[PDB]
Design a binder for this molecule. Structure first.
Ligand code: HEM
Length: 153
């Protein structure tokens, strides 16, 4: 439900994430987990990380942050017409990973915080609002696929 100008703002800021996907992805997952400890429980591979220092050293965390943001990028670039890219994620997250829609709100928050943390200058009021709308559209369409699959939206 974004305008074409709002999509341009989202994709222009996503360009900075593309110049360093893994670094951004690492930072998002650390922010998600240090802000919201219970989300870490969903990642069987990351239990043993007992500190932000262990999380920073974890090559599997960095790899997972990279995979996560590469996929999100794939969704953003389709500007709303992302059914095909969204379905497999909704499927895998609704079933196997057991991710609640609310946790999608926490990682949305971490993405914004990271963008703000790393690009204060480029991530102004307009870019922020546009990214918020893009992530809300993502969250909303994830929730609607979950309902369709028979899960709580
Ligand atoms: C921007 C939102 C998200 C995106 C783009 C995303 C993307 C992905 C991708 C591409 C994978 C690998 C393929 C698949 O299994 O579907 C994955 C796996 C996974 N996701 Fe997500 N995800 C998101 C949010 C979350 C959240 C909020 C959680 C937990 C709080 C989560 C937990 C997991 C887990 C546990 C796996 C499997 C990891 C493993 O190998 O151990 N995801 N996600």
């Amino acid at each position: 439900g974004l305008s074409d100008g709002e999509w341009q703002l989202v994709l222009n800021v996503w360009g900075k994430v593309e110049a360093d996907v893994a670094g951004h992805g690492q930072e998002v997952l650390i922010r998600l987990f240090k802000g919201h400890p219970e989300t870490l429980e969903k990642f069987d591979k990351f239990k043993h990380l007992k500190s932000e220092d262990e999380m920073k050293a974890s090559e599997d965390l960095k790899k997972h942050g990279n995979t996560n943001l590469t996929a999100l990028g794939g969704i953003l670039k389709k500007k709303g017409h992302h059914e095909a890219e969204l379905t497999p994620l909704a499927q895998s997250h609704a079933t196997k990973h057991k991710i609640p829609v609310k946790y999608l709100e926490f990682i949305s928050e971490a993405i914004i915080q990271v963008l703000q943390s790393k690009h204060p200058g480029d991530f102004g009021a307009d870019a922020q609002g546009a990214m918020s709308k893009a992530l809300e559209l993502f969250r909303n369409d994830m929730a609607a696929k979950y309902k369709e699959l028979g899960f709580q939206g």
